[PDB]
Amino acid sequence: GGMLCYVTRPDAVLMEVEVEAKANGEDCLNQVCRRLGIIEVDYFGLQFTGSKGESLWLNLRNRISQQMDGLAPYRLKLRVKFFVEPHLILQEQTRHIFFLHIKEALLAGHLLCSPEQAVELSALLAQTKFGDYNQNTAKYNYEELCAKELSSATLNSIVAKHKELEGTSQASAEYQVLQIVSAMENYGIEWHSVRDSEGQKLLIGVGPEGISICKDDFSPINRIAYPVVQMATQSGKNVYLTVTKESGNSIVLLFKMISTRAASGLYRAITETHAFYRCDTVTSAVMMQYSRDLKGHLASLFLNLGKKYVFDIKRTSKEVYDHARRALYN
């Protein structure tokens, strides 16, 4: 009955969003964006946590009430779904929200960086929160982004770099954070917790370039691009990716997920990310998938001749007459 949604913004602020009882996910997010002054809505999504504690994206085309059936009070987290190059974001509020999202990922160690990267980033984050250097108010955060803190030895370089930023406006400092983070290898990569057969706890990253495979954010086993991935399917708690090897050999990768919703989430993450970054239009992405289905249906039609089409006759009426002529002459 004209249901209430508790939307958490990336600056930790809770919004009370009243939507129509049978409203879609797009209706929530649109009202959230209208109230935040966001025009570039298509970069955003609403994250929620399912029955099995798994983080899922709200489907903008379906009803909220169906998608979040059991789980009430309806709690949604406003998040950037599609990361693009910071300069390509035309509105300043949208840029600030990308920064809010990126700062949170950094301060939670969800994007680990080299000591050299962590020095400039720690100084830029200081300039953003407090402004130009002041001994009274100048707290830093080097430990969260990096592996270990080098104490005074590195703090002297971070206090040195924050001093070089004297004059850098809040917006500019934020833009540089976005610029540095957008250059990173794992920028715009969405990590999903899976199972390789029964053996290992693998982590799948869906990003603009393609699917990334690694065991708990370690050395990437395969940084597979999208043209290499032939097909993908979802069955229950499983995800069946059809990826082809350099020799033409189609090696079907298997992943086991915590739930059916989580398995759907990854399948949708592959289809959606590919279409967003690799297709001209949604129509084009719909076509590409359709074409791949017909193409594949015909590839199975020619994998299995005169056995089924057996005839008892050795000759036709014409052949009989000609064989009788030839037989007598020769």
Numbering used by the authors: -1 to 302, 307 to 332
Paper text:
The second pathway involves the sterol-regulated inducible degrader of the LDLR (IDOL, also known as MYLIP), which is an E3 ubiquitin ligase that promotes the ubiquitylation and subsequent lysosomal degradation of the LDLR. Two distinct protein domains are present in IDOL: an N-terminal FERM (band 4.1/ezrin/radixin/moesin) and a C-terminal RING domain. In contrast to secreted PCSK9, which interacts with the LDLR extracellularly, IDOL is a 45-kDa cytoplasmic protein that interacts with the intracellular tail of the LDLR via its FERM domain. Here we present two crystal structures of the FERM domain of human IDOL.
The FERM344 protein crystallized in space group I4122, with unit-cell parameters a = b = 159.49 Å, c = 76.72 Å, α = β = γ = 90°, with one molecule in the asymmetric unit and a solvent content of 60%. The F1, F2, and F3 regions of FERM344 adopt the archetypical cloverleaf structure of the FERM domains. However, our structure shows that F3ab runs from 186 to 278 and that the region spanning residues 279–332 is clearly outside the cloverleaf region. Based on the obtained structure, we propose to redefine IDOL FERM boundaries as shown in Fig. 1A, with the extra region in FERM (which spans residues 279–344) divided into three subdomains to accentuate the extension away from the F3ab lobe: F3c′ (residues 279–300), F3c″ (residues 301–332), and F3c‴ (residues 333–344), with the latter not traceable in the electron density map. After the α7 helix, the FERM344 structure has a partially unstructured region from residue 301 until residue 317, followed by helix α8 (residues 318–332) (F3c″), which is the last residue traceable in the electron density map. Moreover, there are clear differences in the F3c′ region, where the FERM344 crystal structure has an α helix (α7), following the F3ab, which spans residues 279–300 and folds back onto the F3ab. The FERM344 domain packs as a tetramer in the crystal created by crystallographic symmetry operations. Its extended F3c′-F3c″ region (residues 279–332) interacts extensively with F1 and F3 of a symmetry-related molecule, burying a substantial surface area of 2537 Å2. In the FERM344 structure, the F3c′ is helical and positioned over the F3ab domain, obscuring the access to the peptide binding site. If this particular position is retained in full-length IDOL, it could prevent the interaction with the LDLR intracellular tail, suggesting a possible form of autoinhibition.
